[PDB]
């Protein structure tokens, strides 16, 4: 029934009572664990949905069972039945939305999750009103280099008609161009959506950091290109503290991650566009990115610059080389001040946050797989503290791409 | 599709259906509302799990429906009937504790399942003939430094009768002292045994690296102590190809990895003490043994060494010099001649084994959080391929301790 969580580095252990407000069903059963799964494959339904998360909201604010509690009900009640379906009230988004990333399991900067700048954006018309306030989250959340965490909120989906969304994975994105040999200049995952952007009119640059543009989706129309005004989106050339000719392979990042193809889903209603950005943690950066071979696969030739032997797998040239990228971008953003978190700090932090949360609300979804980085992994306190992985409501989900 | 788990590899992007896991006939930890994947620890039903294995047996010698196996499967109802329990034939055995290798999901030297040398211990005795029969197999295994792998398989279970056990976790483990101080001397995942066997009569040494006595238990007898001769317990001193200073730490680690309190469960039959060995990935020794701060916990001393800033954790510090401490201990059996692999040879031989097992049983039962290595993990292939963890037999499980 309930669970038990240990942690093996320190002999503690808690109970998760938590996992038993989840209404949402995972991948696993009793017969075989499938946790490492990137991902799946009525009135009624919304209207208890709907009860629950204005329940949530009112205890959020410790006023359950007062008046302003009964009449909100009643006026839920009363607007699906008419309408099949109703509308939050901004606070009410605002709180779902500071929800939906608290609840969130793959995210290990949960932290922060009260700290949330949230843009109410559900007055938007046209692909031209979300490519403005598209501008305005980017100039706030980025903020000179001092990075606030936002989320703007587009209309919710419709059952009588299509969904606004924006077909990018991220606000901010390298192209990626394929070649006539069959190889990629640019960023490999980006590959299909630059294509797109072409096909549907953009003239491509060809270089290895060219940021992409956006087609934004408004219902029921073909999607629209905008290019980001080039000074809202600041980047971070590499350096490294030691190593002279890091510089001279040209790399760079952007700052801000704002995943922006997730819907989010608040009181059983979906929100179809609703980016949101925090700031990186190193390793996203310096090891997937930069080091993953289905990404810019740098490694073999940073580790040819530091001239390590590439012959044999036992002289570590990968793990060498991909502990000086990381400690690169560290360096170059700490220097640019532009905010990051590295992989010791964020972990120590999380610590905290499941510490938090245990006291609070008698558990933590979290899923191990992803909030253990990907180098380094033992030498992290998360590495060795037992989770528990369940779908909390309100949430981010997955969704099909528009095309 | 199929409507078997779809199983991604996210570096090439392909796909496998896992039909294995349908062979499942035991549950585990995980239910559709919640993931319990990351946890550490979790006479009729005799006879049908006894046919399973039959079964199983005559599969892989190819005679499935013919006059010997079922005469066989005929043969050990009437031994189950007459006498509660029943026997393993020799090649049964044989096939049974390489079953149980192979459907172990958190071993990534799978690729080896095929060569494993299985010493037949069923007429055991006393702990003096299980002490002889120890040290044989340490002997083989050992093999100068050319490591074997095999299992030596004492008596099973019996009705209302003592079991044979090993108390020890592990053939060859390093003492553990508690100091008066607070601290500890030696490896403090051994604190207990190291007690026990004090308890039981052992004279304490006073070192980092002393190692064990064995606590071995005949049948419904206090367990008898047996020191290993130190001619058969094969160490190798740890020194750094290119660190002068290192072979200074006088580190050192035994050169046989040597499972022993696991019970190895065949059709139904249950091995209480059945030690298995192998020889140890890089990682085991270098990052978890000498880096966890539960453990020798090393990683402070050799940063200073380095002299690294300890005192920030985005100077990465740790990551240097745990990657040092690896190739420390690669180099130093490499020297030695002693067999050791890396994480980026094993991990590879480990997509090799998946790609095996697809073709011969549609599946492989895998335990990520515990095949990717705990440096490194996204480097190594096997963090990018999905995995089913489910529980197959024979098995190897956990099991009480016996005191
Ligand atoms: C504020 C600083 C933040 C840090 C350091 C951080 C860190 C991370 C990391 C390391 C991941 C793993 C992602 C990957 O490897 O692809 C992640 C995932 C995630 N984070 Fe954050 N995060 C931050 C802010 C936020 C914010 C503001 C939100 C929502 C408003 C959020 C929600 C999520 C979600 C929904 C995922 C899941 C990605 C997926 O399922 O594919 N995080 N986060
Ligand atoms: C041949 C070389 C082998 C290598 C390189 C190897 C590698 C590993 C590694 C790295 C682990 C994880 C250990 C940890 O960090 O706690 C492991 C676990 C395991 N291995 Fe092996 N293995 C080998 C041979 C064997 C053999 C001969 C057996 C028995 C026949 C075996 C059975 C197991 C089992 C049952 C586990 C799970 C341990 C647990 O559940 O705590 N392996 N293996
Ligand atoms: C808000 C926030 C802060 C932060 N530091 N980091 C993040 C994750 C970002 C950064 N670094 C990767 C990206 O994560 C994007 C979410 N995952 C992407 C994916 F891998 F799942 C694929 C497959 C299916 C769905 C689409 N893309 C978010
Ligand atoms: C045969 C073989 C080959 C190889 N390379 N490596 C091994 C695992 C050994 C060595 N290095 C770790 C140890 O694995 C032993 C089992 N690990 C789990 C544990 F240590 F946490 C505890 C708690 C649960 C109960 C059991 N023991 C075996
Ligand atoms: C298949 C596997 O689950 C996949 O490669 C995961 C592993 N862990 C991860 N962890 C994080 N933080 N981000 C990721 O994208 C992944 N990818
Ligand atoms: C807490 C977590 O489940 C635990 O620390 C696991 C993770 N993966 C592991 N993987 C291996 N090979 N060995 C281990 O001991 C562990 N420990
Ligand atoms: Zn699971």
Not at 103 to 131: H, T, Y
Request: with cysteine.
């Amino acid at each position: 029934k309930f669970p038990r969580v240990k942690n093996w580095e320190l002999g503690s252990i808690t109970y998760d009572t938590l996992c038993a407000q989840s209404q949402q069903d995972g991948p696993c059963t009793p017969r075989r664990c499938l946790g490492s799964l990137v991902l799946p494959r009525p009135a009624e339904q919304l209207l208890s949905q709907a009860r629950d998360f204005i329940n949530q909201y009112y205890s959020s604010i410790k006023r359950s069972g007062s008046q302003a509690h009964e009449e909100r009900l009643q006026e839920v009640e009363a607007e699906v039945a008419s309408t099949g379906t109703y509308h939050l009230r901004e606070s009410e988004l605002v709180f779902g939305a500071k929800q939906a990333w608290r609840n969130a399991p793959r995210c290990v900067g949960r932290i922060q999750w009260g700290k949330l700048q949230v843009f109410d954006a559900r007055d938007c018309s046209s692909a031209q009103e979300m490519f403005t306030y598209i501008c305005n989250h980017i100039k706030y959340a980025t903020n000179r280099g001092n990075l606030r965490s936002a989320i703007t909120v587009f209309p919710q989906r419709a059952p009588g008609r299509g969904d606004f969304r924006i077909w990018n994975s991220q606000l901010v994105r390298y192209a990626g161009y394929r070649q006539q040999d069959g190889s990629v200049r640019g960023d490999p995952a980006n590959v299909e959506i630059t294509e797109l952007c072409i096909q549907h009119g953009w003239t491509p640059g060809n270089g290895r950091f060219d940021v992409l543009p956006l087609l934004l989706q408004a219902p029921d129309e073909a999607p629209e290109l905008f290019v980001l005004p080039p000074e809202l989106v600041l980047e971070v050339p590499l350096e490294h503290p030691t190593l002279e000719w890091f510089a001279a392979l040209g790399l760079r990042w952007y700052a801000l991650p704002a995943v922006s193809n997730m819907l989010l889903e608040i009181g059983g209603l979906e929100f179809s566009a609703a980016p949101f950005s925090g700031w990186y943690m190193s390793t996203e950066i310096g090891t997937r990115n930069l080091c993953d071979p289905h990404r810019y696969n740098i490694l073999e030739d940073v580790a040819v610059c530091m001239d390590l032997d590439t012959r044999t797998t036992s002289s570590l040239w990968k793990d060498k080389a991909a502990v000086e990228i990381n400690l690169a971008v560290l360096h170059s953003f700490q220097l640019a001040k532009v905010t990051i978190v590295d992989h010791h700090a964020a972990t120590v932090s999380f610590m905290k946050h499941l510490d938090n949360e245990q006291k609070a609300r008698g558990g933590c979804p979290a899923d191990w797989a992803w909030i253990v980085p990907p180098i380094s992994g033992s030498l992290t306190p998360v590495f060795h503290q037992e989770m528990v992985n369940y779908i909390l409501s309100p949430a981010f989900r997955y969704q099909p791409d528009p095309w």
